[PDB]
Design a protein around this ligand. Structure first.
Ligand SMILES: O=c1ccn([C@@H]2O[C@H](COP(=O)(O)OP(=O)(O)OP(=O)(O)O)[C@@H](O)[C@H]2O)c(=O)[nH]1
Length: 419
C-alpha cells in the first residue's frame, strides 16, 4: 500500500509545469467518438482514468495510441457497447452513450447496479438523450439508446445542474438535426473546453460557460489537433504549496482565467502574484500567509475543490480565518488529521474556524479525498520531522506524479511501502 514519506520543514520554491486537466481530457476523449477524421489530443495527463478510457475506446473499434498526446482514429467504430468489465471502475464511462447513438444510431453502456442501493444516478444522461429523440431501453445494470437516423434538436431545461449530463447532451446535439438549447447548463471551465474541442471539429456551439448553451446540429465532425486546458485545481495546489512555505513559484502551462477567485483569495493572504497568458507566479517574499475568509460557491466563485488547500493555508497563517462550504456538507473530515499535526481549529456546521500556528508536527495521517490527501502531503512538507501520508493512490488518480513535482520544488519526499 503506497505511502508518502515526507521530511520537513522545507521551503517549496521554483517551477512546476501544470498537467492537462483530467476532467476536460475525459469528456474530450469520449467526444472524439464523433470524429470521422484522426485527432491529436495534446496535453493529456498520464492517469488511471485515461488508461481506462483508452481501453474502452479500443474496445469500441477506435484506433488509439499515446505518449504527451493521445492519438485517436474513430473513423471505424464497429462495436457499440461498453461492457461491465471495462466500465466497472469508471463512472465517466457513461460519456460513450451520447456519441454512439448520435453518430451511429445506437449505443449501450453497462451500469453496475444503477438499480443497486446507493448507485449513482444517470437519469439526466438518459432523459437528456430521450429529449433528443433517442429511444431508450432500460434493464437493471444497463442502458441502451437508439434512433432511426439523426437525433433531433430540442429545448432542454435542466432541473438539476450537471457537469456530466451537460457533456452528454451537448456532445450528442452536435450531430442532431436543428438547434438544441440547454438551460441551466454546468458552467465549469471543463465544459467550455469540451465545447471548444467540439467547435474545433466543426460543431456549432455558443454560450459555453454561461447558464445557456446553444447547439446547432451539423453534418459531421472532422479531425485535427486539440490542446486540453491546464489543470486548474492542480495549479491551485502548487500555488498554495508556495504560499504556505514562504516560497516563490512559477506555474508553467497554466491558464490564469480559470482561477479568478483563487488568485484574488491568495492576494488576500498577502501573496505577490503575477500572470501571463500561459503562466502564473506566486511570491511570499519569505513571509507567513495572512488568514483569510473563504466562501466556496458554484463556478466562477471560489471552488470547493480548493477548500482543503486553503484550510491548510489558514492553519499556518497569521491570525484567525473561517472557511465556509455553502453548498456541500461534510467537507471537513480531514481537519482532525491536521489537528493531530498541531493545528488549531474548530469545525462548526458547514464551517471550520482556523487559528494559525507557527509550525506543524510530523505524524501518520490519511484522507480518502484527493484534495484533502494532497493537503496532507503539503502539510508534511512544512511540518517539523517525519510525516507519513497513507493510501496515496487517491492522489495518484488525480495528480500526475506529484512526488516528482514536489521534489523539484525542494521537498524531501519518498514513495514508500509499509505493510
Ligand atoms: O444523471 C445524473 C447525473 C448527475 N446527477 C447528480 O447531479 C449532481 C451533480 O452532477 P455532476 O455531473 O456535476 O456531478 P458528478 O458527475 O461528479 O456526480 P456523481 O458522480 O456523484 O453522480 C450529483 O450530485 C449527481 O448525483 C443526477 O442525479 N443524475
Amino acid at each position: 500500500m503506497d505511502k508518502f514519506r515526507v521530511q520537513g520543514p522545507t521551503r517549496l520554491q521554483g517551477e512546476v509545469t501544470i498537467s492537462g486537466a483530467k476532467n476536460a481530457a475525459l469528456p474530450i476523449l469520449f467526444a472524439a467518438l464523433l470524429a470521422e477524421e484522426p485527432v491529436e489530443i495534446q496535453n493529456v495527463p498520464k492517469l488511471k482514468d485515461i488508461d481506462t478510457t483508452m481501453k474502452l475506446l479500443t474496445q469500441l473499434g477506435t484506433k488509439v495510441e499515446r505518449x504527451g498526446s493521445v492519438w485517436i482514429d474513430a473513423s471505424n467504430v464497429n462495436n457499440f457497447s461498453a461492457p461491465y468489465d471495462l466500465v466497472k471502475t469508471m463512472r465517466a464511462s457513461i460519456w460513450a452513450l451520447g456519441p454512439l447513438v448520435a453518430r451511429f444510431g445506437q449505443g449501450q453502456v453497462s451500469l453496475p447496479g444503477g438499480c443497486a442501493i446507493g448507485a449513482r444516478p444517470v437519469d439526466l444522461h438518459i432523459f437528456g438523450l430521450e429529449k433528443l429523440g433517442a429511444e431508450i431501453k432500460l434493464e437493471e445494470g444497463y442502458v441502451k439508446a437508439s434512433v432511426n437516423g439523426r437525433l433531433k434538436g430540442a429545448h432542454i431545461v435542466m432541473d438539476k445542474v450537471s457537469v456530466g449530463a451537460t457533456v452528454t447532451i451537448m456532445s450528442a446535439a452536435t450531430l442532431a438535426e436543428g438547434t438544441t438549447i440547454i438551460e441551466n447548463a454546468a458552467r465549469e471551465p471543463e465544459i467550455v473546453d469540451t465545447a471548444n474541442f467540439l467547435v474545433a471539429l466543426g460543431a456549432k456551439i455558443s454560450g459555453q460557460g454561461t447558464d445557456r448553451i446553444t447547439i446547432e446540429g451539423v453534418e459531421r465532425l472532422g479531425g485535427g489537433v486539440y490542446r486540453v486546458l491546464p489543470d486548474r485545481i492542480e495549479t491551485g495546489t502548487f500555488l498554495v504549496a508556495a504560499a504556505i512555505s514562504g516560497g516563490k513559484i512559477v506555474c508553467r502551462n497554466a491558464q490564469p482565467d480559470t482561477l479568478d477567485a483563487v488568485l484574488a483569495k491568495l492576494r488576500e493572504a498577502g501573496a505577490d502574484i503575477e500572470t501571463g497568458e500561459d503562466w502564473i507566479s506566486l511570491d511570499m517574499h519569505g513571509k507567513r500567509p495572512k488568514a483569510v475568509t473563504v466562501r466556496t460557491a458554484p463556478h466562477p466563485a471560489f471552488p470547493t475543490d480548493m477548500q482543503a488547500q486553503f484550510t491548510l493555508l489558514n492553519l499556518v497563517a497569521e491570525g484567525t480565518g473561517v472557511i465556509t462550504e455553502t453548498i456541500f456538507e461534510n467537507r471537513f473530515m480531514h481537519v482532525p488529521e491536521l489537528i493531530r499535526m498541531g493545528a488549531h481549529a474548530e469545525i462548526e456546521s458547514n464551517t471550520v474556524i482556523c487559528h494559525g500556528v507557527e509550525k506543524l508536527s510530523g505524524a501518520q495521517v490519511m484522507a480518502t479525498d484527493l484534495r484533502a490527501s494532497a493537503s496532507l502531503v503539503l502539510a508534511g512538507c512544512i511540518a517539523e520531522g517525519t510525516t507519513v501520508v497513507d493510501r496515496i493512490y487517491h492522489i495518484d488518480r488525480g495528480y500526475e506524479r506529484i512526488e516528482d513535482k514536489l521534489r523539484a520544488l525542494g521537498a524531501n519526499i519518498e514513495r514508500v511501502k509499509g505493510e
